[PDB]
Design a binder for these strands. Structure first.
Lengths: 136, 94, 75
RNA sequence: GGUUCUCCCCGAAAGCUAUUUAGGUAGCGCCUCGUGAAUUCAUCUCCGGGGGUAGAGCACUGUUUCGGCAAGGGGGUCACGACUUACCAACCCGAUGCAAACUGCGAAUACCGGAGAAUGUUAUCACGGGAGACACACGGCGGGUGCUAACGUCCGUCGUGAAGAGGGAAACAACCCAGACCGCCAGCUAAGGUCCCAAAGUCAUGGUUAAGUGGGAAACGAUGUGGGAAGGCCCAGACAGCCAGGAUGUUGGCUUAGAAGCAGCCAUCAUUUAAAGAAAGCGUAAUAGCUCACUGGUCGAGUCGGCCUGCGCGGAAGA
RNA sequence: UCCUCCUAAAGAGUAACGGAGGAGCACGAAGGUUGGCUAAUCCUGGUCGGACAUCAGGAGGUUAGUGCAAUGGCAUAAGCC
RNA sequence: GCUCAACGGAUAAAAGGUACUCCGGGGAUAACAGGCUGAUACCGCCCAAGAGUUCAUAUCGACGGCGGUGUUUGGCACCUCGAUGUCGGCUCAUCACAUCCUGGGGCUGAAGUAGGUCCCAAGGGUAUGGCUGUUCGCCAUUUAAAGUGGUACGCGAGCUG
RNA sequence: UGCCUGGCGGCCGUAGCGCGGUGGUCCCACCUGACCCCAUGCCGAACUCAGAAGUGAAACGCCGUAGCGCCGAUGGUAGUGUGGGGUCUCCCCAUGCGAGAGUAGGGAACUGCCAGGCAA
């Protein structure tokens, strides 16, 4: 359950998810999962995907998480009228743009890497693709 | 044997480059030395096939444009953010 | 427990570069000194910049710190 | 609530500030009539301007992942000297991110000023007489709020309705086209259309679709079908089929309860060899057993597995 | 009621029972002028003294300070005597 | 000389109840129903850790994900305040299928009887009483079953209160 | 006219840091003393006066070095005004404007006035 520590402000504006991803290349491992769609990932989804791969690889190799939530999201309690101030913070999400690399991995065969990432992508709400580290 | 067929670009800009890429053809630039930079266009499918191997960026390459041969080296290249395509290549004259 | 705010102070540049002004006219209203007084320009107690002579106002960057200055030339 | 004859000209607002004020009212903004004024004003070109928004970035304020160097901290050899570390870790260095209340960078537009041509019934400003209005709505764009729910709510800017008929979207104030002075059984066009209802192509050329898709809906699934770039094996004959082979210790030491390949510690040896592994599936308490990896012979020519995508199918149940 | 930032869309202004904080003072000096001075944080040595008192040197260049929350500004210092 | 702080300060000087109520208005503004929405609810599907004698997928399926319905609880305040009677019961019904029974099938950790789960199917059928105003629910005894919902949470110019 | 030096500027990191070399004829700095002028919240430290022995150590000026900072294209990309389109909580087309970062490269300054010494 990734979450920041002592953030400057409890609440922040909704904002927008326009634009294009920055971390579009593999930088740590040899294989990675790239985001094709656009959306937001909650902390729970990131944890679920991480657990799926660790089990798949059987604690062999290394796992890199290239996304952090660092964005609180509020939700009004049930049977509450509009207004009366901003809602309380419930969960943290990370905004994902197309081309963003979600997870990176190294130290395992390419064949075993594909199934591990496929299992993780099955527990994410955004279209994803498998990429390999490029030479320069 | 990295022989690349290239042509001199006629018009430049965001609109021109996007139109060029839509025709399965992407732009590139050659610079270096005391010669003016040369803007070129070249086929995309062929470059993808021969740039897959790791040693494409190792040794010098030869560019054939309008019957002139230029020896270059892959200096920089821009991928598509989420597709297996190329946006631009920077070539340094060797 | 929010909901409080202060009335806007309508700061900013009142006269822009290349337009003639009369002596004593306010050129820039500012909290600090974003622009420093140059030639024929005076600085008020609240860091307001006003014209000390009649002429055209111009902006420029001078000094080792590249700080912005406002001057007036008699034209 | 109601307010009675006609015609002509112009033509709003639903904003700001204040209010025991919020459905009232006052000043201003907007409308009208009159009077007086300066290339006064607008559009475009050029010139002079200051921004810190989009984007970007991580020097700074915060946050974030990995690797290194690692002061320092614990346990341990020492005789006031001093030392090691399987173990905790500061500050920094290299790489990767994030921010409305971060900025070592920084647009497009907008806004202010100056010069110039054309155009516009002075379209500008000042003063005077009379007002209405201060419940706005939807649409596009930039946002806050909500669930990036609401024909929701709150702001900025433009459009339309309000206060605008006509044509189009089957019907449909606010969507698209377009601003009705009157008459004509005249013509050309806009959006949108041309098989019939129903005005106009059953028009021409090249493709796709088999689904009534077109004429609602996702994750995801699949030898549907079209095209493109490649790649492996192929008449010293490939792929699928066809009568064939697939053995010997390896009932293992190992946790000896049996794992013997089919629970794992483990190597992942070695002969016959046209050919076979100390083991992939089904099946036994383990056995056994049946297949496939691989290898001979005939016919025999293409076949196999992925990527990019065009159009389709399933997923798809309501009175 | 008043002040600072954001929302606020790079002039000004701009709403919400939107997101964060403050004020109802203080000072005859904390004002005027003249003269002079330049921090925080780290490293090394040194009695008590110890991570953190004071002294000396070095890196540092304002991360300090500015009577009071925040923003902007401040070396010609608006900071200190 | 005023926390005249309700800070452009209506007086120097002021708190409550009305279901005994009254008048002027408003769907500019609530309560029942409709409408929009679908957070929540219900239903279906994707991945699959694991359970199931070994074996993920006979049967369940965590950590997560994607949809449908407008059946609950909600949001909005568009319609109605110059009036749309809003819980139960009775009588009378009608439609949907996400089927309770009957009918036809696949799989089964289906020996048979009896089951579990899924698919097709709406032709017909689909209780009586005790307690409570109750819907619901508990209880008693039957049946092949005593289905889930829509219809102004169907139906008061049809009845009861 | 040139090598130099000091002062006052323009310009402001291509101008600033790090390392090495170089300078005492003048000028500059350090330097001796300070009873008196002047000052230490103590100190000739700093400021000030009387001097010039000695020195180029430190500081300062100049030269070299890219080890850093810094500047920086062309091309592409992001964004964006106007007019259209879409499977419309995001994008695409025509046209106009066009970054930031990074890359090749540049880079260890230039210049005006006055005064003084040497050679001319």
């Amino acid at each position: 359950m990734l979450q920041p520590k002592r953030t400057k402000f409890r609440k922040m504006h909704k904002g927008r998810n326009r634009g294009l991803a920055q971390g579009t290349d593999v930088s740590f491992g040899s294989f990675g999962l790239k985001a094709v769609g656009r959306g937001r990932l909650t902390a729970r989804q990131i944890e679920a995907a991480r657990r799926a791969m660790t089990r798949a690889v059987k604690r062999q190799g290394k796992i890199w998480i290239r996304v952090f939530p660092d964005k609180p999201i509020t939700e009004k309690p049930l049977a509450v009228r509009m207004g009366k101030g901003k809602g309380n913070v419930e969960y943290w999400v990370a905004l994902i743009q197309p081309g963003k690399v979600l997870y990176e991995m190294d130290g395992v065969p390419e064949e075993l890497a594909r199934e591990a990432f496929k299992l993780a992508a099955a527990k994410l709400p955004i279209k994803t693709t498998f990429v390999t580290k490029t030479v320069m | 044997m990295f022989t690349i067929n290239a042509e001199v670009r006629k018009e430049q800009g965001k609109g021109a480059s996007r139109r060029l890429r839509a025709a399965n053809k992407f732009p590139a630039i050659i610079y270096g030395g005391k010669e003016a930079p040369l803007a070129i266009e070249l086929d995309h499918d062929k470059v993808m096939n021969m740039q897959a191997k790791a040693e494409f960026y190792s040794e010098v390459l030869t560019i054939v444009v309008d019957g002139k041969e230029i020896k270059v080296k892959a200096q920089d290249v821009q991928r598509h953010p989420y597709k297996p395509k190329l946006q631009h290549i920077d070539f340094v004259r060797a | 427990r929010n909901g409080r705010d202060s009335e806007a102070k309508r700061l900013g540049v009142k006269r822009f570069g290349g337009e003639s002004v009369l002596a004593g006219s306010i050129i820039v209203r500012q909290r600090g000194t974003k622009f420093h007084a140059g030639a024929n320009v005076g600085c008020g107690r609240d860091h307001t910049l006003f014209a000390k002579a009649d002429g055209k106002v111009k902006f420029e960057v001078k000094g080792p710190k590249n700080r912005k200055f406002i001057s007036i030339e008699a034209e």
